[PDB]
Structure 1
Amino acid sequence: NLYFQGSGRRLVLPVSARTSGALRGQAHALARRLEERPGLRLDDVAGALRADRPALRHRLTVSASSVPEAVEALRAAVPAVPPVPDEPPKVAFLLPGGGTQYVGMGSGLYRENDVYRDTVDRCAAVLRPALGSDLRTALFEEVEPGSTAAFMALFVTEYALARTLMEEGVRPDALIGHSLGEYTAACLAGVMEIDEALPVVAERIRLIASSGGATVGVAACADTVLPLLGEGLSLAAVNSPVACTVAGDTDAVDRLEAELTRRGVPFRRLRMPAAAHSHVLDPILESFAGHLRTLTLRPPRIPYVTNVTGDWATDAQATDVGHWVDHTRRTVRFADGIAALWERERPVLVEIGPGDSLTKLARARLDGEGPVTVTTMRHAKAQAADGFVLAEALGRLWSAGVDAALPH
């Protein structure tokens, strides 16, 4: 059952000291105090940790739904982020592309968080005409892998999760999306309106899927891979010094994999039999533009880097149908874009969506600038509750210096 339950007992307990060393001890002191004081309710400690202490430079948090849990976590507590900077840090949202979606994602947030519930409900209703079904079936019960609904489930999950973070007062200073995630970024930035984007993204997915072809993810930098392509092959994504993807017709991809295998290059065929970001899409570009022409495009009110150039999007690009056509046809320059995003703001990098695929690419590309990264929703196999994962994210954001992230 996905009946609304509201927020749990789950609370975030903040701790801040003036030394990394006083942090460890003060977290252990608080643990002893909770043991030796059965009067102390958990909600009073939480409120008191906010109102009665100054938010100092060295921070950590625990999440807990009860007192023994909080005590256990406070003993194991290790500072995890650097001391907060003197100016408040910038925040960036990283919005993943296809590949991480799964049935059941965000079902915990759907039942605890009314912004997440309402955003999902609204998107599901807008999408019924283009999709032919209720998206919430695909989100929470069952879905055909790689279907239109499966990818729309990811788009709406990213969008709902970002709205949920923004309602907590975590608003991004910059955005970057990977592939499909660039549409979520555009909706969040004000370039597109979510209600107009939803059916257009859906028809876009259908046109890409019906174009056939194949995509292979290669664990190597693009400079190593480029000489091996390939009539019938395009560089589909340049993701990090050890990650790129190649797309084209199936026979050409087969041949590339044989050559990669002869050179010891690790690779894996992506499950979706499509070839987004390659010449295979040429026959549907004009028809896709016709759908793009239904959108009211506006200049971004939150800055974002586009995968077309791997750089900040201009107002002229954001509002241009042919640029959005380029976004679908051309290499996703994510490695360049994450470096452009980092050089300007040095922001906290917050992955908005299931898993940690963009976080790993950011860490590989930004080595060793020491980026602070925050993950926001679990992988398909993880046993953690969605609301626990979210509470941890918000605590960690507060520990990095994003004060509005602490709930209550």
Structure 2
Amino acid sequence: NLYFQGSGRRLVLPVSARTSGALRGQAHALARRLEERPGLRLDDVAGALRADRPALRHRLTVSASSVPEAVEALRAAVPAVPPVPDEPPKVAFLLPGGGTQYVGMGSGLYRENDVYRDTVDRCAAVLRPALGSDLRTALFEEVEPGSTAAFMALFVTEYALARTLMEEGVRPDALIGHSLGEYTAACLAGVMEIDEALPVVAERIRLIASSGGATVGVAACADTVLPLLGEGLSLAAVNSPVACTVAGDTDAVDRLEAELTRRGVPFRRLRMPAAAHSHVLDPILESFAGHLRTLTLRPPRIPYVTNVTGDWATDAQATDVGHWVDHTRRTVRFADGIAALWERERPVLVEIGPGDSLTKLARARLDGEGPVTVTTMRHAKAQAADGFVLAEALGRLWSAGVDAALPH
């Protein structure tokens, strides 16, 4: 059953106080009021909490589908974000690359949220010629791991999730993508049109996937890893002080893993037998440029940092075919890019996509500047409903000072 059900009963209850402090206090008060009043409907308490109390500096929220569920959450409630700053905070979207896609992702939002449903539906129809199948099959029923559809499923999930949040009035002041997430960022930023981008991203993935090679993620500083490379190897990404990835010919990768083992450096072979962001891709760069030439590229209407330089993208870069070729061939400078994003805006960091991979990289790179981070979709494995994870994200965004995030 993926028939539309609409919104369910799940609501977000906001609580604000003036002290760290009184916040805990009122959250218990509200719980005591709720169990001691069987007249009260979640319905009305949610409304009253918005209209009949000011939005103060110290905030928390709970999510609930019924009053006993809310009572228990309000008991356990502990403030999770710092008090709202005096100016409303900036919001950044972090768009993951491949590696956390799974069959079933967002199926709860597809059944509950009509913007999410329409965006997926629209992307599936656009993509049917390039893909050769209905994307919703890969999204919700079955997919070949590492296939073109599996990667397009992640792209559309990211885009549908971003549009859903913006429909709530959470619009990003800045964007950063990792690898494939940079295309999602470009579409959200106005650099590309999602309709033209869908088939081009699809053919991009085929051209990369069929170039062979291998990719190893290494849990170490890039400075530690650099001396061990290596003919036949490229530094594929620099992600955080304890994360980088190396790609190249399979034999060169095998050797690197042997020398990494001998020095006690932890690593993991990535599933995908591809070698994105490495010399292995040279034979297909010009053909891929041919596909890039069919896009209408425009300067970004929302600023974003590119992985190419680890800095804000210039209008000349965003609109240059050769820069996008570089984005595919060159190191993903995410750790730098996340520092550039932080220095300017100091924004709330909202991961748009399944899991928390960029959130962990941000925490490692931005230690100990204290970023507030928000996560938006569960790991494959997690037992929470998609609608709950999203209601929590929005409550948390409101608690941090993004007032428009609170629904209704």
Task: Give how far 1:79 is off.
Answer: 0.1
1:35-50 equivalence runs, <5 A: 35-50=35-50
Secondary structure, aligned partner of 2:73: helix
Task: Give how far 1:84 is off.
Answer: 0.1
Task: Give how far 1:36 is off.
Answer: 0.3
Distance 1:205 1:42 in 2: 47
CA offset digits 1:214-271 (Å, max 9, x no partner): 0000000100000000000000000000000000010000000000000000000000
Task: Give how far 1:320 is off.
Answer: 0.1
Task: Give how far 1:375 is off.
Answer: 0.1
Task: Give how far 1:29 is off.
Answer: 0.1
Secondary structure, aligned partner of 1:92: strand
User: In percent, how many aligned pairs have the same letter?
Assistant: 100
Distance 2:40 2:111 in 1: 29
Task: Give how far 1:144 is off.
Answer: 0.1
CA offset digits 1:286-345 (Å, max 9, x no partner): 000000000000000000000000000000000000000000000000000000000000
CA offset digits 1:349-408 (Å, max 9, x no partner): 000000000000000000000000000000000000000000000000000000000001
Distance 1:391 1:281 in 2: 41
Distance 1:166 1:52 in 2: 26
Distance 2:190 2:39 in 1: 49
Q: Tell me the TM-score normalised to structure 1 length.
A: 1.00
Distance 1:162 1:249 in 2: 36
Distance 1:72 1:271 in 2: 41
- The residue number in structure 1 matching 2:168 is 168
Task: Give how far 1:88 is off.
Answer: 0.1
CA offset digits 1:58-94 (Å, max 9, x no partner): 0000000001100000000000000000000000000
Task: Give how far 1:281 is off.
Answer: 0.2
Task: Give how far 1:193 is off.
Answer: 0.0
- The residue number in structure 1 matching 2:388 is 388
CA offset digits 1:165-190 (Å, max 9, x no partner): 00000000000000000000000000
Task: Give how far 1:198 is off.
Answer: 0.1
Distance 1:352 1:84 in 2: 22
Count of residues paired in the alignment: 408
Runs of 4+ in structure 1 deviating by more than 2 angstroms, as ranges, are none
Where does the alignment leave 5 or more consecutive residues of structure 2 unmatched?
Answer: none
Where does the alignment leave 5 or more consecutive residues of structure 1 unmatched?
Answer: none
Task: Give how far 1:20 is off.
Answer: 0.7
Distance 1:259 1:56 in 2: 56
Q: Tell me the TM-score normalised to structure 2 length.
A: 1.00
Secondary structure, aligned partner of 2:305: strand
Task: Give how far 1:22 is off.
Answer: 0.3
Distance 1:184 1:20 in 2: 38
